[PDB]
């Protein structure tokens, strides 16, 4: 499903992402926008054999198990296909684990290249939350 910006902001707020471990809500909307264009079914096959899944493009080498990625660690303890749902629950649970590492949101390459250092609260302005 393709979320609207304000729609996603209100959902991510409901899923407890506003100020989770020091990251204001706008970070998460901005990251979704550049990682997947707000599409919960987005998938991206990498050159190393892994695949990035869903709205936050969570990687099958470290985070979820898709059964086809060589040294998969399955850190979120979840099948990757659970991240391709229009309900964002599993993606948000996994993301909270990811961001609890000392790397924080630098795990998301598009966030790091297009969001960090910008006025990320601009992604939630103009929205009823």
């Amino acid at each position, epitope marked *: 499903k393709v979320f609207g910006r304000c729609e996603l902001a209100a959902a991510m707020k409901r899923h*407890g992402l506003d100020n989770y471990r020091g990251y204001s809500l706008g970070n998460w909307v901005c990251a979704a926008k550049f990682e997947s264009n707000f599409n919960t079914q987005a998938t991206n096959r990498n050159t190393d054999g892994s695949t990035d899944y869903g709205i936050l493009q969570i990687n099958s080498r470290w985070w979820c198990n898709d059964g086809r990625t060589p040294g998969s660690r399955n850190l979120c303890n979840i099948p990757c296909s659970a991240l391709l749902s229009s309900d964002i629950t599993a993606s948000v*649970n996994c993301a909270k684990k990811i961001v609890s590492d000392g790397n924080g949101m630098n795990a998301w390459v598009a966030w790091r290249n297009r969001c960090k250092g910008t006025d990320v609260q601009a992604w939630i302005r103009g929205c009823r939350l």
Partner: antibody
Framework: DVQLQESGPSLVKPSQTLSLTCSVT????????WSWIRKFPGNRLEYMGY???????YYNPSLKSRISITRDTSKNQYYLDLNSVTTEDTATYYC???????WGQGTLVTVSA | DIVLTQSPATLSVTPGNSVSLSCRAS??????LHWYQQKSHESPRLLIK???QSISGIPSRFSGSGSGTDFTLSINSVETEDFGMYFC?????????FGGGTKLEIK
């Protein structure tokens, strides 16, 4: 099925370093984030810290930096070192995964001269 | 640090009644609140995560609800195996903290 089990001394002296070990059976230590938690005598729980997959550590500031958590992939164990213990460090210590589903049985450590 | 206050500190109840325990946070923590049970001579057991998400292997009489600062754990029809201590825990901010606990015991 993963199993966790604490070990170390049950009695220590004031000002020494307490060292505990958590052995993991069932999966590799590289597949989770790992933590130490302790329970004081009138049921107060304290989250001590955890080590995540990059090796970064987070420590509770109530411990005033006397703690260190390290892991040993080879032995599939991770450790707790608590320096300069006092009688206030008497407690039951548990290791557990960050997600909170797997806990060891807990070990009581008493600090006394 | 976020402080978590639980109430009541102790609740006595007859098997078969329904009870509700409360956990209040000193700041808004969204849905980042988990509940643990601790029976005598046992290590904590995770019952509910993220305020209301169910966990496989736990009786379905346990349910959780709330957001922001006010959270509740409900036990529909208490059984004798439910007696023990209940704690809430927040993982919104580092250091993670626990509430002081509620003791559930036979009336």
């Amino acid at each position: 099925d993963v199993q966790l089990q604490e070990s170390g001394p049950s009695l220590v002296k004031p000002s020494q370093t307490l060292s505990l070990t958590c052995s993991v059976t069932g999966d590799s230590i590289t597949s989770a984030y790992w933590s130490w938690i302790r329970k004081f005598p009138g049921n107060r729980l304290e989250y001590m810290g955890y080590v995540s997959y990059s090796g970064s550590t987070y420590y509770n500031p109530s411990l005033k930096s006397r703690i260190s958590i390290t892991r040993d992939t080879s032995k599939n164990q991770y450790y707790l070192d608590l320096n300069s213990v006092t009688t206030e460090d008497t407690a039951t210590y548990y290791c557990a995964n960050w997600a909170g589903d797997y806990w060891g049985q807990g070990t009581l450590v008493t600090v006394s001269a | 640090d976020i402080v978590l206050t639980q109430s009541p500190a102790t609740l006595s109840v007859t098997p078969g009644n329904s009870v509700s325990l409360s956990c209040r946070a000193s700041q808004s923590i969204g849905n980042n609140l988990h509940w643990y049970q601790q029976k005598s001579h046992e290590s904590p057991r995770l019952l509910i995560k993220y305020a209301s998400q169910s966990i496989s292997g736990i009786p379905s009489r346990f349910s959780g609800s709330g957001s922001g600062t006010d959270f509740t754990l409900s036990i529909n029809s208490v059984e004798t195996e439910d007696f023990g201590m209940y704690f809430c825990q927040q993982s919104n901010s580092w250091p993670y903290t626990f509430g002081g606990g509620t003791k559930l015991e036979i009336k």
